[PDB]
Design an enzyme around this catalytic site. Sequence first.
Site, PDB file in Angstrom:
ATOM      1  N   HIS A  79       0.796  -1.226   0.000  1.00 48.75           N
ATOM      2  CA  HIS A  79       0.000   0.000   0.000  1.00 48.75           C
ATOM      3  C   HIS A  79       0.826   1.272   0.000  1.00 48.75           C
ATOM      4  CE1 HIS A  79      -4.332  -0.357  -0.301  1.00 48.75           C
ATOM      5  NE2 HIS A  79      -3.985  -1.636  -0.272  1.00 48.75           N
TER       6      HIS A  79
ATOM      7  N   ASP B 235      -7.621   3.438   9.131  1.00 47.28           N
ATOM      8  CA  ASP B 235      -8.932   3.550   8.478  1.00 47.28           C
ATOM      9  C   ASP B 235      -9.274   2.333   7.613  1.00 47.28           C
ATOM     10  OD1 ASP B 235      -8.983   6.143   9.512  1.00 47.28           O
ATOM     11  OD2 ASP B 235      -8.511   7.089   7.589  1.00 47.28           O
TER      12      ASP B 235
ATOM     13  N   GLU C   5     -12.632  11.790  13.741  1.00 50.34           N
ATOM     14  CA  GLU C   5     -11.954  12.216  12.519  1.00 50.34           C
ATOM     15  C   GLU C   5     -12.753  13.392  11.966  1.00 50.34           C
ATOM     16  OE1 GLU C   5      -9.687   8.122  10.973  1.00 50.34           O
ATOM     17  OE2 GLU C   5     -10.812   9.345   9.525  1.00 50.34           O
TER      18      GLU C   5
END
Length: 497
Positions: free
Chosen positions: A74, A138, A251
């Site tokens: 990633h 997340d 958030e």
Amino acid sequence: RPWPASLAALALDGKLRTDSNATAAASTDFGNITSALPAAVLYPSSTADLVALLSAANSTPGWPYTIAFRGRGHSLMGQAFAPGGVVVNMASLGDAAAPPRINVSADGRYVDAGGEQVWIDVLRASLARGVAPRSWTDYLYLTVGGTLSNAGISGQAFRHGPQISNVLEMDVITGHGEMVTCSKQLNADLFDAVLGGLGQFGVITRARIAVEPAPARARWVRLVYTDFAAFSADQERLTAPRSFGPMSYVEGSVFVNQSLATDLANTGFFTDADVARIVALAGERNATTVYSIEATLNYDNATAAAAAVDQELASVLGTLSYVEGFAFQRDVAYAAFLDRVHGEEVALNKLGLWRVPHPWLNMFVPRSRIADFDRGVFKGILQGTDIVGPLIVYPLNKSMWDDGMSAATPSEDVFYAVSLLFSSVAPNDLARLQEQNRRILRFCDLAGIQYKTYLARHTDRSDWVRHFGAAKWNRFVEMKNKYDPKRLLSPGQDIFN
Ligand SMILES: *[C]C1=C([C])[C]=C2N=[C@@]3(/C([C]/[C]=N/C4=C5N=[C][N]C5=N[C]=N4)=[C]/[C])C(=O)[N]C(=O)N=C3N([C][C]([O])[C]([O])[C]([O])[C]OP([O])(=O)OP([O])(=O)O[C][C]3O[C](N4[C]=NC5=C4N=[C]N=C5[N])[C]([O])[C]3[O])C2=[C]1
Ligand SMILES: *[C@@H]1O[C@H](CO)[C@@H](O[C@@H]2O[C@H](CO)[C@@H](O)[C@H](O)[C@H]2NC(C)=O)[C@H](O)[C@H]1NC(C)=O
Ligand SMILES: *[C@@H]1O[C@H](CO)[C@@H](O[C@@H]2O[C@H](CO)[C@@H](O)[C@H](O)[C@H]2NC(C)=O)[C@H](O)[C@H]1NC(C)=O
Ligand SMILES: *[C@@H]1O[C@H](CO)[C@@H](O[C@@H]2O[C@H](CO)[C@@H](O)[C@H](O)[C@H]2NC(C)=O)[C@H](O)[C@H]1NC(C)=O
Ligand SMILES: *[C@@H]1O[C@H](CO)[C@@H](O)[C@H](O)[C@H]1NC(C)=O
Ligand SMILES: *[C@@H]1O[C@H](CO)[C@@H](O)[C@H](O)[C@H]1NC(C)=O
């Protein structure tokens, strides 16, 4: 030239591949912007195979192969590549069904997970035992070793600290090829260096993660603001130390006016009725930007749980200043909330909008300058463009970070995680986004904002020195000399390569 026996054994067993299929798969990452072909890819079936590779490298005069540990890849700018070297396909360590690569402690106080394991599996294994990690990312389809090599943050980090602050011990194979178990009480130097160490000192094969009793559900809420000052003031109130407030997660999101209706609808949170009201609110306030706090309150299956949450939530909300009547609630199973982004992935991928270039801009901005950042970027630079991808913003408490660890953070007690997750969907729109990112960084440098990047790899030594800070940099180098003397590990970070 000569090969050590244990290294040749790897090739003999077909674990060392050089075919184009193997090298190609390990030459690209999520960023989809840079690529580099390795000379070979290793598919280890046990930690012994890793010891063999690293030992060979350490004992072979002139060893010319850099080594990278690919988790899920990633990375955004080639941090998991080994140009002309050897990329380790970490997932291979988990091909075997036994022995398990994830073991919840007998006393349920922690969970041992292989460095290659993805958090979604760590979550499932934990829940099966009625527990779960306290600090997340997340997105759950990332590896334990991968997020720990960076920091690992999400809405829980303000009270529990990043994932690197929730590790009891680890097994690490250093650049010397030595298997070392470390913690705050044993080989603490390696422990602190590896956490947020960007894969520069060794490969994490096992991480002991702290857990808490697993909540059953999450009351999920979004609050809307048209005034940034009120928005940020409320995020800081919800995340301020009291011990912290009730909220389990906090958030925030930035919605530019131009594509407001579409973006709100694409959140998968608001109903068309909610969207219509927010669009109307924006026009009434003549706002070029709309802000939304996203928070949750975890609770279990107790008969009175739901009612208690309603009261707790009512109280907390009463201390806030979001636009009257603009509090929106949802209620879901804890696991569903945690894996929320996987659904976004599925939808985007179907549209062919997931596997595209991701010129993401991520940084930590000191609280004292967040308002300036909002003015210059959200209300400035970004205005007039068609934004695709979420713009995430939320405060973090420095007190929950261990500055002895490799991860770098701003000096202020409170700083914001700012993640502008731009997706290059339009034809050839990449160049424009890359230039825009340089412009944003330029704006911050000229404004004197002392930010720290996150998930980014610099290509100039002076930038890395300023990143960690001169004194901290010397410590980083000392650990590099001790654990990766040949400077072979994770060359894609471009620190010592
Ligand atoms: C791709 C991605 C995604 C999708 C996600 C994520 N997440 C995060 C962030 C955020 C985001 N968000 C989002 C959202 N929201 C809503 N919606 C949405 N969408 C999207 N997104 C960022 C920005 C979180 O959350 N947090 C954090 O903190 N982070 C994240 N991320 C990033 C990550 O973490 C990274 O990438 C890391 O790296 C991990 O991964 P992996 O894959 O696992 O890994 P790699 O890449 O392969 O690698 C890296 C590095 O490291 C090293 N290693 C590995 N492994 C290991 C190592 N070392 C040692 N040991 C071991 N074991 C290598 O070599 C390199 O160098 C994200 C993303
Ligand atoms: C999880 O626990 C199992 C035992 O319950 C561990 O299994 C051993 O693993 C080592 C190498 O990892 C093998 O050499 C042993 O033969 C295994 N023994 C058993 C009981 O099968 C495993 O290592 C643990 N892994 C974690 C998550 O730490
Ligand atoms: C917010 O964006 C909307 C469009 O997304 C703007 O509305 C357009 O404004 C132009 C010029 O005033 C009109 O010609 C269009 O017909 C409007 N379109 C829509 C969506 O109705 C709006 O002006 C923007 N508001 C602010 C404060 O920037
Ligand atoms: C509604 O908001 C818009 C945008 O903030 C206001 O228009 C701006 O006006 C200033 C000064 O006149 C200009 O420098 C900006 O360029 C304008 N916005 C843009 C980029 O088009 C507008 O005045 C506001 N409406 C009122 C008067 O309340
Ligand atoms: C980017 O992704 C596309 C499709 O997924 C692929 O064709 C291309 O080779 C990738 N480029 C890089 C630099 O990863
Ligand atoms: C919470 O309740 C749900 C539904 O009754 C159940 O599936 C889940 O296992 C419970 N959580 C616990 C204690 O495991």
